[PDB]
Amino acid sequence: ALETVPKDLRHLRACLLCSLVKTIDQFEYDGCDNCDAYLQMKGNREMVYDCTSSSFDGIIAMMSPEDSWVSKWQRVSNFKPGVYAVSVTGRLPQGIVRELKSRGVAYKSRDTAIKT
Amino acid sequence: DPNLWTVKCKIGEERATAISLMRKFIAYQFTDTPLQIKSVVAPEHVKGYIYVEAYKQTHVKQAIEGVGNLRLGYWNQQMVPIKEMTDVLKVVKANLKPKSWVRLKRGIYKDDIAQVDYVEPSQNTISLKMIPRIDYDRIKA
Ligand SMILES: [Zn+2]
């Protein structure tokens, strides 16, 4: 859709669960689409900087999760189309990750990149 | 499994090409001439060409028509082996973490190692640790 497309290249962040790369204005107004009920992002800015982090590299133009090898490798087949990444460095604090497992959300590390 | 193709591009324009391609796909997805491209990879370390995912060469050949940026890489479509379908996504250590060591390019402390202390969420300025090198105003006039 036209709501998930980044509008301006400057001031872009990325999520850590589904690695959703968009613009800060969309994050403040729309927020993470693939996971909204379990993350509570729409209607505030502090949580954006709490969970999402700008430390990420790599961009991919994802259009068909159901039929693509990159999606299977990244484990993002059950997500909506959009611009994702391949390496998001970061880790959520010990106050938000706890409730994800209780509600039936498996927290995995999307930082597929290697260290040294 | 789908194949990954390679197309040449200009040096310094990789995110603009990606956003233009996504806009074209979104604008021409409900028409009689859709795009069969699955995905494109634009790694940050590489600069000078981009990748594209599709089964046949005709798909990407007819999907990059009209664009004025990929005109250079239009008469040749190279195919990479299946073993290279996993090294492109690899990244060697983004690169923004506090209490880390970074280097400077401009200023006076050129080619010197420093250390990060605090990061501003505004993404406009960042603190840095370094030992001063000035002469304390004794040599200069
Ligand atoms: Zn996410």
Swiss-Prot record, chain A:
<dbReference type="GO" id="GO:0005634">
    <property type="term" value="C:nucleus"/>
</dbReference>
<keyword id="KW-0805">Transcription regulation</keyword>
<dbReference type="GO" id="GO:0006355">
    <property type="term" value="P:regulation of DNA-templated transcription"/>
</dbReference>
<dbReference type="GO" id="GO:0034244">
    <property type="term" value="P:negative regulation of transcription elongation by RNA polymerase II"/>
</dbReference>
<dbReference type="GO" id="GO:0032044">
    <property type="term" value="C:DSIF complex"/>
</dbReference>
<keyword id="KW-0007">Acetylation</keyword>
<dbReference type="InterPro" id="IPR022800">
    <property type="entry name" value="Spt4/RpoE2_Znf"/>
</dbReference>
<dbReference type="GO" id="GO:0045944">
    <property type="term" value="P:positive regulation of transcription by RNA polymerase II"/>
</dbReference>
<feature type="binding site">
    <location>
        <position position="15"/>
    </location>
    <ligand>
        <name>Zn(2+)</name>
    </ligand>
</feature>
<dbReference type="Pfam" id="PF06093">
    <property type="entry name" value="Spt4"/>
</dbReference>
<dbReference type="GO" id="GO:0006368">
    <property type="term" value="P:transcription elongation by RNA polymerase II"/>
</dbReference>
<keyword id="KW-0863">Zinc-finger</keyword>
<dbReference type="InterPro" id="IPR009287">
    <property type="entry name" value="Spt4"/>
</dbReference>
<dbReference type="GO" id="GO:0032785">
    <property type="term" value="P:negative regulation of DNA-templated transcription, elongation"/>
</dbReference>
<comment type="similarity">
    <text>Belongs to the SPT4 family.</text>
</comment>
<feature type="binding site">
    <location>
        <position position="18"/>
    </location>
    <ligand>
        <name>Zn(2+)</name>
    </ligand>
</feature>
<feature type="modified residue" description="N-acetylalanine">
    <location>
        <position position="1"/>
    </location>
</feature>
<keyword id="KW-0832">Ubl conjugation</keyword>
<comment type="subunit">
    <text>Interacts with SUPT5H to form DSIF. DSIF interacts with the positive transcription elongation factor b complex (P-TEFb complex), which is composed of CDK9 and cyclin-T (CCNT1 or CCNT2). DSIF interacts with RNA polymerase II (Pol II); forms DNA and RNA clamps that stabilize Pol II elongation complex while maintaining the nontemplate DNA strand in the transcription bubble and nascent RNA in the exit channel. This interaction is reduced by phosphorylation of the C-terminal domain (CTD) of POLR2A by P-TEFb.</text>
</comment>
<dbReference type="GO" id="GO:0034243">
    <property type="term" value="P:regulation of transcription elongation by RNA polymerase II"/>
</dbReference>
<keyword id="KW-0010">Activator</keyword>
<keyword id="KW-0539">Nucleus</keyword>
From Swiss-Prot, chain B:
<comment type="function">
    <text>Component of the DRB sensitivity-inducing factor complex (DSIF complex), which regulates mRNA processing and transcription elongation by RNA polymerase II. DSIF positively regulates mRNA capping by stimulating the mRNA guanylyltransferase activity of RNGTT/CAP1A. DSIF also acts cooperatively with the negative elongation factor complex (NELF complex) to enhance transcriptional pausing at sites proximal to the promoter. Transcriptional pausing may facilitate the assembly of an elongation competent RNA polymerase II complex.</text>
</comment>
<protein>
    <recommendedName>
        <fullName>Transcription elongation factor SPT5</fullName>
    </recommendedName>
</protein>
<comment type="similarity">
    <text>Belongs to the SPT5 family.</text>
</comment>
<feature type="domain" description="KOW 1">
    <location>
        <begin position="96"/>
        <end position="129"/>
    </location>
</feature>
<feature type="region of interest" description="Interaction with SUPT4H1">
    <location>
        <begin position="1"/>
        <end position="93"/>
    </location>
</feature>
<comment type="subunit">
    <text>Interacts with SUPT4H1 to form DSIF. DSIF interacts with the positive transcription elongation factor b complex (P-TEFb complex), which is composed of CDK9 and cyclin-T (CCNT1 or CCNT2). DSIF interacts with RNA polymerase II (Pol II); forms DNA and RNA clamps that stabilize Pol II elongation complex while maintaining the nontemplate DNA strand in the transcription bubble and nascent RNA in the exit channel. This interaction is reduced by phosphorylation of the C-terminal domain (CTD) of POLR2A by P-TEFb.</text>
</comment>
